[PDB]
Design a protein around this ligand. Sequence first.
Ligand SMILES: [Mg+2]
Ligand SMILES: [Mg+2]
Length: 172
Amino acid sequence: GSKPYVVIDIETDGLDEKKNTIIEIGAVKFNGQQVEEFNALIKYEEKLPPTIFKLTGISKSLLDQEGRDLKEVLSEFLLFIGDLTLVGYNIHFDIQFINNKLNKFGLPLLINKTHDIMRYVKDEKLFLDNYQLQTALKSYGIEDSVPHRALKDARLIYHLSTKVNKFLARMK
Ligand SMILES: [Mg+2]
Ligand SMILES: [Mg+2]
């Protein structure tokens, strides 16, 4: 069957890998036998743009109450993923942020192989109006609204990955 792989997803407070930061990190690992999950909200000392609240529902209060230290979370994330293939949707966004913060804290950077589900979708679904994750999901019969929360989005990307035949063939 499938080789092991880990679907990753983050939420951030902006688009700049070097000035903005990670507010949530989620992952769905198929370990070769079954599925495991990773999720952490990140403690945050800056002024969270209310735009972040409207998209994700994450507020300062949530990060204050449930957030964990970013360096600690990233160390645990490295242990969760090991050297497994990483999978995502426009995955360079997640990797750019994760590597920037790993580097900032003096932690090892990612050297994992990667596959981007978005690339497979663009080649299989040529007539989509756009290639946002939400649009891709519907094209494959997944009607869930995208919540813009890291683990919840990772679950949706994982479900998508089990429906993209070209990806499945590559991972056999
Ligand atoms: Mg995302
Ligand atoms: Mg997300």
